[PDB]
């Protein structure tokens, strides 16, 4: 009965009796569709059928209008300017839009808790199989292990996964909405401020710079919002990883943590090499593109003289030597970084198992081993991304 | 030219002819429906001045 | 003569009120499978030959769930076929039911795929096949469960019971996904009659009159 | 009044695979497979080793097991290295060289009516961007798609080795996965294109306003120009909102597919246990892979999107 009532709440549309683009379904979606994002199914169908155009998109939800957001942030910005000796736009934006980021922090806390519950259910299921077999081999005394516990651990893995997913994507929903709010509001405030900006001020600050305020800086605040929750949910997601992994492996976990930490600087060094060499490749590309641009703009005279052969030779020299040597070099460093990403998640576990085996008298059993692989997989991400988070944070500052 | 002011056909034609814009508008592939290129490189300097005068007058 | 090795014979009604296992597998589910073969092959042929291309109904979570759940029912029937014990493999009713129902499931999968594009009404032989399957499997579940409760033993093992329970759930779900879902369509006169756009279950429960029953309750 | 979506241009994929020497493509796929086989064999060896440590109350003969485990892991790492080197040196570089050569020969040999017909920008763009994309992005995306496709094939293979009835679970989920992947593969591209289309008008209107700032204030058209700016924004956000909740939609469905895979792997492994033929190692191995499967499903879907994005460059 309760399942039926739940279905009759969830699934049924509510009927209604007797050129613009339609209102957004996020406003007409019950909490279950807001959780499973199943209000996007209509637009997912339309785009699969036909090439979408700006008329196919549903209008924005209730509180996404740039007017409303700009006024909402402007009230607080004026309060900051008239209230504080040292007004801070950061706290203005925080007052306005931090409610959703606290809610997203709550969902991220839950998601980290469940993400690190999953290895614990794995350890428990392996330990349960071990005990269950160790009893049945004795049989082939009272209150021996039930097989039910295996199925209930399996179903708890499913429940953890499902609730994990629901909370995670409400975290993403809220942080990405907050990024959209911050951009939709600072863009309108930048515009309305320029419309009252003094001529001498607007001459001192170039028009290129002023439009970069809206084209770049606001994009970097928006990109901050996606990452801001990791300023604590990276440390949290590492602390509970280290605790789980310590209670699992002992102090032999520290070998793995050390390996990941020290591969972080090498990773960042190679990342710098990668971006440097990509930019160099782009400038060789610009060189070859200049060659092509002159060839094409001069094509008439070029074909008249039949000089297209030597100019083809020049273009191909530029490409084959400069651009292709650079690109092969980039490929080799791509190989090095691919090797690193393949080996380091291996090497961390192999080395920590070595240190475990030689330090502890315990048996390196299955339930210690495979939860350790899972936990090292979970630990890689926060260590791998704290650099990008702090980079984003200083850029946003 | 309208620059946000509601279109009245008679006054718009009067302003187009008063600015003497008609001759320069006839050269446009779509006349008054011709889009001026990005950054305004699709029109002459004096013609752009006349267009600004047209906007001011139609206001 | 006697194709069944169960002591509780082909007698349609067992000592308990239920249908015997021989009856469920031998006539209910076996005739359901033969009904699907015989008539779903016919409908499949006709739906292919009627038109080269479909009416452009929008492929949906409903068609993908019908195809997934039909494949899932194939999975459960295959697992049940393997769960046959050496004793039950001598039960021609059981083995024939499983072979025939696998063949009917393949026909039903093809018929879902074609039907969805080619027919406005949810197809009749599909609906009745899933209503005979949800009932043969629900009466097999009842049979297994009654035998457990009185004779103390599962006649297919507790895994056979579990597979039967999942077959009940799966077939009920497929039956609902045939019956209830409207088929969507992608991009002053009075409208065409719903008796023409009503699947056999709405033609039976006269539930195509519900719209006009609402309109008249609301307005004159 | 609208343009129907089109099936994929597989001939383009085969022309790219002919650009890269298809023997070298076969080698590159081979070393993806060897990399993944050595990875999964490293974990199988780890399963065996841990079972040994488990039956014997303490770790026997450790150096041998640890050395073989390390050997298998390094085999996977070197297979990945050789894989990427083959991809770049032999496949992608050869294809970029061949395609640029072919296009230059053709463009130069074209009659002047071609240059007259088409704008010069539309040729310079293909010689710059559509060549840069096949230079770098396309090779990388094919790497990240085949690595992950092979990874999913092998996680499914290892889970099905543990409990072969998992194939019956993965086939229905295969149908759902393909449906979700197809819907996302198209609407994600559409919505991402619409976001990129509607983004520029904000800044273009802003430069225009900064140029005409004094005139706007003069006619006191400030409120109308502000409203135009806000319409530019709200249009961009109405194209961006779907572009992000598209990812949320997708990722939710794929994480249900992953959770159901974990449930299927775990429950079928426990059924095997009840049958008495399960060891803790099999469940540990199977289920570790089942826990990893969801992010690799997401990688595959997003790399199908990126491959489709970058292959129109080979088309052009
Ligand atoms: C608006 C409100 C109404 C709308 C509802 C519409 C649809 C109606 C659905 C509800 C149907 C009600 C069915 C009543 C439940 C029957 C419960 C039977 C329990 C029972 O009899 O006890 C045990 C039966 O054994 C057993 O194990 C038998 C198990 C199965 C019993 C067979 C019942 C068949 C009918 C139920 C299926 C209906 C589903 C319809 C889709 C015997 O115990 P013991 O004491 O004798 O043990 C002594 C051992 N020596
Ligand atoms: C629950 C888990 C399920 C697990 C499944 C295992 C998955 C394994 C991987 C499969 C996942 C992706 C499946 C792809 C689906 C698909 O193809 O659907 C395609 C789209 O596929 C793609 O866009 C990318 C495919 C890439 C194929 C590469 C071919 C060789 C290229 C050669 C170049 C190589 C050299 C590089 C150096 C659309 O089709 P349809 O439009 O016609 O649509 C026709 C409909 N009318
Ligand atoms: C522990 C036991 C609990 C009992 C059951 C718990 C399940 C929780 C029920 C929540 C209902 C889900 C909310 C969905 C809301 C909604 O659909 O809302 C209907 C939506 C339309 O969006 P709207 O919410 O705006 O109306 O439907 C769609 O257009 C697309 C459907 C979503 C696409 C995903 C497809 C999933 C397929 C399901 C498999 C079917 C198998 C069934 C037999 C097994
Ligand atoms: C033995 C076990 C078998 C398993 C289940 C067997 C049931 C058989 C299923 C047949 C489906 C019925 C056909 C209806 C088709 C249809 O609705 O079609 C949908 C119709 C619309 O008409 P159309 O058929 O043209 O689409 O819905 C309506 O507009 C009105 C609904 C009918 C009014 C009657 C209300 C009945 C309420 C049901 C009670 C809900 C309780 C659920 C929890 C217990």
The closest residue, in CA terms, to atom 4 on ligand 1 is A1
- DSSP letter at B37? P
Interchain CB distance below 8 Å, D168 and C68: no
By Cβ distance, the residue of A292, A339, A353 closest to D80 is: A339
Closest CA relative to residue A184, chosen from D243, D193, D237, D225? D237
**A373: buried, middle or exposed (CB in 10 Å: 19+, 13-18, 0-12)?**
buried
Closest CA relative to residue A130, chosen from D288, D161, D283? D283
- Identify each DSSP E strand in D153-293 by its residue range: none
Structure tokens at C194: 């719903």
The C-alpha atoms of residue C11 and residue C20 are separated, in whole angstroms, by 7
No. of helices (H) and no. of strands (E), chain D: 11, 0
The C-alpha atoms of residue C40 and residue C26 are separated, in whole angstroms, by 20
Q: Calculate the CA A216 to chain-centre distance.
A: 19
Q: Are D107 and A299 in contact (CB under 8 A)?
A: no
Q: Are A70 and A189 in contact (CB under 8 A)?
A: yes
Pocket test of ligand 2: the residue of D142, D154, D167 to mutate, having most ligand atoms within 8 Å of its CB, is D142
Assess C69–D contact: CB distance below 8 Å, yes or no: yes
CA A59 – ligand 3 centroid, Å: 24
3-state DSSP assignment of residue A198: coil
CB atoms within 10 A of CB C169: 18
* CA distances, D61 to each of A130, A358, A367, D48, D67 (Å): 22, 11, 20, 13, 10
Q: Are A178 and A101 in contact (CB under 8 A)?
A: yes
Q: Dmax of chain D from CA atoms?
A: 90
Pocket test of ligand 4: the residue of C140, C195, C210 to mutate, having most ligand atoms within 8 Å of its CB, is C210
For the four alpha carbons of A210, A211, A212 and A217, in that order, the dihedral sign comes to positive
Q: Are C78 and D168 in contact (CB under 8 A)?
A: yes
Contacts of A50 in chain C (CB under 8 A): 187
* CA distances, C27 to each of C30, C34, C155, C168, D52 (Å): 5, 10, 18, 17, 53
The C-alpha atoms of residue D31 and residue A262 are separated, in whole angstroms, by 28
* CA distances, D74 to each of A267, A346, D289, D310 (Å): 19, 9, 20, 32
Beta bridge partners of A50: D4
Q: Are D77 and A327 in contact (CB under 8 A)?
A: no
HSE toward the beta carbon, residue C23, CA cutoff 13 A: 16
**A316: buried, middle or exposed (CB in 10 Å: 19+, 13-18, 0-12)?**
middle
- Measured at the CA of D225, the angle between CA D221 and CA D229, to 5 degrees, comes to 170
* CA distances, A90 to each of A105, A152, A181, A234, A304 (Å): 18, 48, 14, 22, 63
Interchain CB distance below 8 Å, C75 and D171: yes
> Solving technique for this entry?
cryo-EM
The C-alpha atoms of residue A300 and residue A232 are separated, in whole angstroms, by 63
Beta bridge partners of C57: C185
- Identify each DSSP E strand in A124-282 by its residue range: none
3-state DSSP assignment of residue D2: coil
The C-alpha atoms of residue A364 and residue D50 are separated, in whole angstroms, by 6
Beta bridge partners of C185: C57
Q: Dmax of chain C from CA atoms?
A: 68
> Resolution of the coordinates in A?
3.2
For C109-142, letters b (16+ CB in 10 Å) and e give: bbbbbbbbbbbebbbbbbbbbbbbbbbbbbbbbb
Contacts of D205 in chain B (CB under 8 A): none
- DSSP letter at C20? P
Contacts of A342 in chain D (CB under 8 A): 35, 39, 76-77, 80-81
The C-alpha atoms of residue D268 and residue D274 are separated, in whole angstroms, by 10
Closest-approach residue (CA) in chain C for D4: C187
Q: Which atom of ligand 2 is nearest to the CA of D305?
A: 23
Q: Are A280 and A326 in contact (CB under 8 A)?
A: yes
The C-alpha atoms of residue D185 and residue D123 are separated, in whole angstroms, by 28
Q: Calculate the CA A54 to chain-centre distance.
A: 27
- Identify each DSSP E strand in A183-314 by its residue range: none
Q: Which of residues 293 through 312 in chain A touch D, CB cutoff 8 A?
A: 293, 295-297, 299-300, 303, 308, 312
- Which ligand places an atom closest to the C-alpha of C130? 4
Structure tokens at D19: 């650009």
The C-alpha atoms of residue A218 and residue A352 are separated, in whole angstroms, by 44
Closest CA relative to residue A211, chosen from D165, D203, D187, D314? D203
The C-alpha atoms of residue A372 and residue A376 are separated, in whole angstroms, by 6
Q: Dmax of chain A from CA atoms?
A: 100
3-state DSSP assignment of residue C185: strand
Interchain CB distance below 8 Å, A366 and D54: yes
For helices D22-55 and D138-162, give the axis angle rounded to 10 degrees. Answer: 40
Residues in chain D: 316
Closest CA relative to residue C58, chosen from A41, D82, D45? A41
For A197-224, letters b (16+ CB in 10 Å) and e give: beeeeeeeeebeebbebbbeebeebbeb
Q: Calculate the CA D10 to chain-centre distance.
A: 17
CB atoms within 10 A of CB A300: 11
């Amino acid at each position: 009965t309760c399942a039926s009532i739940l279905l009759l709440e969830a699934l049924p549309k509510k009927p209604l009796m007797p050129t613009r683009r339609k209102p957004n379904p996020y406003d007409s979606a019950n909490i279950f569709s807001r959780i499973t994002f199943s209000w996007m199914s209509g637009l997912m169908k339309t785009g699969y059928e036909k090439y979408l155009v700006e008329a196919d998109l549903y209008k924005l939800p209730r509180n996404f209008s740039s007017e409303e957001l700009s006024q909402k942030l402007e009230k607080n910005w004026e309060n900051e300017l008239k209230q504080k000796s040292n007004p801070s736009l950061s706290w203005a934006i925080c007052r306005t839009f931090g409610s959703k980021m606290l809610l997203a922090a709550f969902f991220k806390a839950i998601h980290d808790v469940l993400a690190f519950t999953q290895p614990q259910l794995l350890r428990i299921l392996i330990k349960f199989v071990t005990d269950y077999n160790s009893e049945r081999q004795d049989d082939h005394h009272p209150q021996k292990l039930p097989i039910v516990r295996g199925f209930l651990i399996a179903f708890a893995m499913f429940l953890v996964g499902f609730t994990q997913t629901s909370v995670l994507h409400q975290y993403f929903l809220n942080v990405f909405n907050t990024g959209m709010y911050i951009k939709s509001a600072l863009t309108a405030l930048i515009y309305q401020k320029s419309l009252v900006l003094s001529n001498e001020a607007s001459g001192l600050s170039s028009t290129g710079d002023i439009v970069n305020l809206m084209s770049v800086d606001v994009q970097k605040l928006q990109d901050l919002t996606q990452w801001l929750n990791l300023i604590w949910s990276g440390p949290f997601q590492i602390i509970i990883c280290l605790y789980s992994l310590y209670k699992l492996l002992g102090n032999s976990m520290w070998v793995g943590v050390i390996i990941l930490v020290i591969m972080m600087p090498l990773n960042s060094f190679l990342m710098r090499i990668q971006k440097k060499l990509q930019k160099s490749q782009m400038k060789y590309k610009d060189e070859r593109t200049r060659v092509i641009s002159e060839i094409l703009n001069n094509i008439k005279s070029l074909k008249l003289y039949a000089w297209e052969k030597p100019y083809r030779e020049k273009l191909e020299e530029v490409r084959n030597n400069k651009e292709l040597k650079n690109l092969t070099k980039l490929g080799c460093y791509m190989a090095v970084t691919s090797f690193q990403f393949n080996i380091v998640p291996f090497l961390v576990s192999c080395c920590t198992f070595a240190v475990f085996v030689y330090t502890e008298d315990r048996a390196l059993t299955t339930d210690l081993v495979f939860p350790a692989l899972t936990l090292f997989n979970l630990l890689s991400f926060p260590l791998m991304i704290i650099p990008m988070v702090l980079n984003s944070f200083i850029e946003a500052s | 030219i309208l620059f946000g002011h509601r279109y009245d056909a008679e006054f718009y034609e009067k302003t187009i002819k008063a600015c003497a814009l008609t001759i320069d508008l006839a050269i446009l592939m779509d006349g008054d429906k011709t889009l001026v290129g990005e950054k305004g490189i699709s029109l002459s300097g004096g013609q752009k001045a006349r267009l600004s005068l047209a906007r001011a007058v139609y206001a | 003569c006697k194709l069944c090795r169960s002591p509780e014979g082909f007698g349609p009604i067992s000592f308990y009120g239920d249908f015997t296992q021989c009856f469920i597998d031998g006539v209910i589910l076996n005739l359901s499978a033969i009904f699907m073969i015989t008539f779903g092959i016919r409908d499949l042929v006709n739906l292919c030959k009627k038109k080269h291309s479909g009416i452009k109904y929008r492929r949906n979570w409903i068609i993908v769930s019908r195809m997934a759940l039909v494949l899932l029912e194939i999975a459960f029937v295959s697992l049940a076929s393997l769960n046959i014990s050496k004793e039950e493999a001598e039960n021609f009713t059981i083995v024939s039911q499983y072979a025939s129902t696998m063949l009917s499931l393949f026909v039903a999968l093809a018929l879902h795929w074609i039907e969805y594009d080619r027919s406005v009404v949810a197809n009749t032989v599909l609906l009745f096949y899933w209503l005979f399957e949800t009932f043969g499997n629900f009466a097999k579940l009842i049979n297994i469960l009654i035998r457990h409760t009185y004779e103390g033993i599962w006649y297919s093992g507790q895994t056979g019971f579990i597979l039967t329970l999942f077959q009940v759930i799966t077939c009920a779900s497929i039956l609902l996904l045939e019956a209830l879902p409207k088929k969507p369509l992608m991009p002053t006169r009075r409208k065409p009659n719903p008796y023409d756009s009503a699947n056999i279950f709405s033609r039976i429960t006269f539930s195509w009159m519900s719209g006009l029953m609402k309109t008249g309750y609301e307005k004159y | 009044e609208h343009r129907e979506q089109g099936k994929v241009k597989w001939n383009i994929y085969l022309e790219y695979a002919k650009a890269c020497n298809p023997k070298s493509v076969c080698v590159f796929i081979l070393f993806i497979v060897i990399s993944m086989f050595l990875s999964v064999m490293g974990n199988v060896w780890l399963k065996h080793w841990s079972e040994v440590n488990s039956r014997y109350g303490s770790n026997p003969n450790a150096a041998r097991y640890l050395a073989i485990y390390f050997a298998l892991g390094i085999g996977s790492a070197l297979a990945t290295l050789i894989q990427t080197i083959v991809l770049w040196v032999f496949c992608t570089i050869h294809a970029s060289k061949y395609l640029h050569n072919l296009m230059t020969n053709s463009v130069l040999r074209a009659p002047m009516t071609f240059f007259e017909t088409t704008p010069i920008g539309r040729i310079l763009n293909r010689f710059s961007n559509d060549i840069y994309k096949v230079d770098a992005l396309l090779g990388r995306t094919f790497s990240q798609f085949f690595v992950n496709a092979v990874k999913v094939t092998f996680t499914i293979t290892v889970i099905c080795a543990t409990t072969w009835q998992f194939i019956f679970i993965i086939i229905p989920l295969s149908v759902f996965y393909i449906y979700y992947q197809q819907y996302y593969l198209r609407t994600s591209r559409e919505l991402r294109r619409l976001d990129s289309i509607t983004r520029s008008p904000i800044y273009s209107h802003f430069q225009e306003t900064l140029g005409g700032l004094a005139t706007v204030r003069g006619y006191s058209q400030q409120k109308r120009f502000s409203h135009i700016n806000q319409c530019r924004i709200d249009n961009n956000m109405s194209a961006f909102y779907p572009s992000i909740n598209a990812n949320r939609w997708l990722a939710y469905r794929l994480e249900l597919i992953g959770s159901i895979i974990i449930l299927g792997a775990a429950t079928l492994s426990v059924f095997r246990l009840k049958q008495g033929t399960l060891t803790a190692g099999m469940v540990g191995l199977s289920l570790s892979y089942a826990l990893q499967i969801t992010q690799t499903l997401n990688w595959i879907v997003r790399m199908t999107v990126e491959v489709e994005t970058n292959i129109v460059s080979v088309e052009r």
